[PDB]
Amino acid sequence: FACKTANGTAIPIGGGSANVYVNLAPVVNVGQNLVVDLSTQIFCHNDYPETITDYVTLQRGSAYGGVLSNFSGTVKYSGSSYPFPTTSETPRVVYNSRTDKPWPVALYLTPVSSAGGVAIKAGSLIAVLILRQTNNYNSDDFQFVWNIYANNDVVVPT
Ligand SMILES: C/C(=C\[C@H]1O[C@H](CO)[C@@H](O)[C@H](O)[C@@H]1O)c1ccc(-c2ccccc2)cc1
């Protein structure tokens, strides 16, 4: 089991860490979500599906900088919404193919009343997401840690 970003940044067997750089809608108003769709950014596969099935959760996710300050968040895992920053581990997604498939995570961030002006700075950390991989074969239990960065400012009009 290993993962990679869309631009090819890999985390190998055993887990590790990588940075992910995302484009964000530049203007977001109150009552709208800023969507950060990581299912187009992070992909994983099973290296031995003949014999092993892998299980993958979002073990935890945290918000940083302008994201935590200026927005109310949820994370959708396989299309289902949970609190973000997280307070528990998600259900487990089955990875049973050597063909890469997305990690099905997306953040939905809606402005709170104190948002106004530059709500997310270009270059800033928006989230750290911990992908946990186990399997049905042995005790392997590995963490793939993704630091998510904004490619551009996001402004909330006032
Ligand atoms: C590829 C592999 C393990 C990796 O790939 C597995 C499948 O994705 C993961 O579940 C593991 O955590 C690890 O990332 C592997 C496991 C067992 C054997 C094996 C084969 C014959 C006899 C004993 C063990 C070979 C490869």
Residue numbers in the entry: 1 to 158
Sentences from the paper on this structure:
The adherence of UPEC to the urothelial surface is mediated through the mannose-specific lectin FimH, the natural ligand of which is the mannosylated glycoprotein uroplakin Ia present on urothelial cells. Mannose-based FimH antagonists compete with this interaction and prevent bacterial adhesion and hence infection. Two ligands are decorated with a para-biphenyl group on a C-linkage to an ethene spacer (CcbP) or to an ethene with a branched methyl spacer (CtbP) and one with a naphthyl group on a C-linkage to an ethyl spacer (CN).
After several cycles of isotropic temperature-factor refinement, we solved the three-dimensional structure of the FimH–CtbP complex with one molecule in the asymmetric unit. CtbP is bound to the N-terminal region of FimH with the mannose ring tightly bound in a hydrophilic pocket able to stabilize the sugar moiety. Indeed, multiple hydrogen bonds are formed to amino acids such as Asn46, Asn135 and Asp140 and also water molecules. Owing to the trans stereochemistry of the 1E ethene group, the biphenyl part of the ligand accommodates the closed tyrosine gate formed by Tyr48 (χ1 = −164.0°, χ2 = −169.2°) and Tyr137. Moreover, the hydrophobic biphenyl moiety also interacts with the lipophilic amino acids Pro26 and Val27 of a neighbouring FimH molecule because of the crystal packing. Despite the hydrophobic pattern of CtbP, this ligand is solvated with well structured water molecules (average B factor of 18.5 Å2) on its solvent-exposed side. CtbP (trans) and CcbP (cis) can accommodate both open and closed conformations of the tyrosine gate formed by Tyr48 and Tyr137. We found that the linker-associated water molecule is shifted away from the C-glycosidic linkages compared with the O- and N-glycosidic linkages and that another water molecule could come in to assist in hydrogen bonding downstream of the C-glycosidic bond.
